[PDB]
Amino acid sequence: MLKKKQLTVLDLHPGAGKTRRVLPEIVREAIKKRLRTVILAPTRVVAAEMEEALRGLPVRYMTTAVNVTHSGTEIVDLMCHATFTSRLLQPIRVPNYNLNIMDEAHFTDPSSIAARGYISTRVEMGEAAAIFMTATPPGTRDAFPDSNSPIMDTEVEVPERAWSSGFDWVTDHSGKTVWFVPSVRNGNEIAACLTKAGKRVIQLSRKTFETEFQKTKNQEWDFVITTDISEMGANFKADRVIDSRRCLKPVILDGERVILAGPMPVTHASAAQRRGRIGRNPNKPGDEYMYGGGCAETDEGHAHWLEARMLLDNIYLQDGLIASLYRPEADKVAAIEGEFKLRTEQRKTFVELMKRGDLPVWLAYQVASAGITYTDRRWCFDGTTNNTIMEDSVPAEVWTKYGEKRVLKPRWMDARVCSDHAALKSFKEFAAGKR
Ligand SMILES: CC(=O)Nc1ccc(CC(N)=O)cc1
């Protein structure tokens, strides 16, 4: 694998030991061969599990998620997918790694897609080797891959709202269930319904994942209600998955606004990863996968692939060259390569709107490409009436940094800034000049 110009897809089935058995073998060989290596974890939770798998190996953990004291001499770096892409974007030196290992390489967040595009382009140029570790590579059509133990697969109507009757099988179960929902708001309704029925429920989503994931180890629970973030190597001691088979798809409308379309079917890769949370123990056959819908290729035209092009257009590679997306996922977007390349000062604004601003890539780009500076929040209030953000069925209002109460009416409307209470609270803080 470790040879220049090689990209290997390590596509062993879910639970086959890619992280705990194969990765340490690859890292030992890399260190022996004096290959400057990067390992990319999707989340801090996985970064901490990798330290356990790699313990005793000389690895520099470029994350506060790992409390270890480094030799200072390590030639293997470990960081999150997003950290890698972030550093490429910023005026910070990133080694031209000889070996690029991406764990959970199916992750479809924009920074992950961009990282795959950058790495696969360096491999294509003959500069680097890469290993993409995932059971579900891009364009996989298999929702039912192999497992460590047999799984009971059942197609069944899954509730997506509070219920009173008709779903006894949900609550009659005496084990532990991981339930994939299409949104935080949908999970909140199901969680409230299960709690009312006497169940102990933990909710996971991207913003809460590190804190709340620890509760799956520290407290007894009956249900975990999670969004798609638990497709990225989240492990549970569960005997059932309930899968809505539904997700939200961010869609850019008329290059003007972003909607959260759906819910709509998941990809085959997503369904396989959801299912792959169970069947992991060869001594515990008969874990259950209950699924409420079919699969479809809902990544086609999904905003994450356009946002990945916005990131990759702004990453230096060589002179004026621009990294291409990883070939198997390159047709998911219809962008003109280079169309999002920003001049130095607009690029800095773009980066800051994403890092400190915590704005979606698309929205960060619209603001930066308009020549607006990071702290200039006038755009949050001067949009069309149809861009009015609502809070409890009335227009959302903030006090501006001038101390004037104004309706939130952004010039560019991205549904992700108000998809749940936490998102809207954050965007209100942004519009008010509070970060
Ligand atoms: C947002 C923007 O300024 N331009 C844009 C380019 C291409 C597309 C189509 C696609 N899904 O690939 C959508 C939007």
Curated annotation (Swiss-Prot):
Query: Domain Helicase ATP-binding, which positions?
Result: 1-155
* Intervals, Lumenal compartment: 1-435
Question: Parent protein range shown?
Answer: 1681 to 2115 of 3419
The protein's name in its UniProt record: Serine protease NS3
Where ATP binds, per the record, is at 12-19
The subcellular localization recorded is:
Host cytoplasm; Host endoplasmic reticulum membrane
Q: Where is the site described as Involved in NS3 ATPase and RTPase activities found in this chain?
A: 274, 277
According to its UniProt entry, this protein's organism is Zika virus (ZIKV)
Pinpoint the Helicase C-terminal domain residues: 150-329
**Function (record text):** Displays three enzymatic activities: serine protease, NTPase and RNA helicase. NS3 serine protease, in association with NS2B, performs its autocleavage and cleaves the polyprotein at dibasic sites in the cytoplasm: C-prM, NS2A-NS2B, NS2B-NS3, NS3-NS4A, NS4A-2K and NS4B-NS5. NS3 RNA helicase binds RNA and unwinds dsRNA in the 3' to 5' direction. Leads to translation arrest when expressed ex vivo. Disrupts host centrosome organization in a CEP63-dependent manner to degrade host TBK1 and inhibits innate immune response. Inhibits the integrated stress response (ISR) in the infected cell.
Query: What does the record say about its membrane topology?
Result: Peripheral membrane protein
Cite the residue spans of the region called Important for RNA-binding. Answer: 3-6
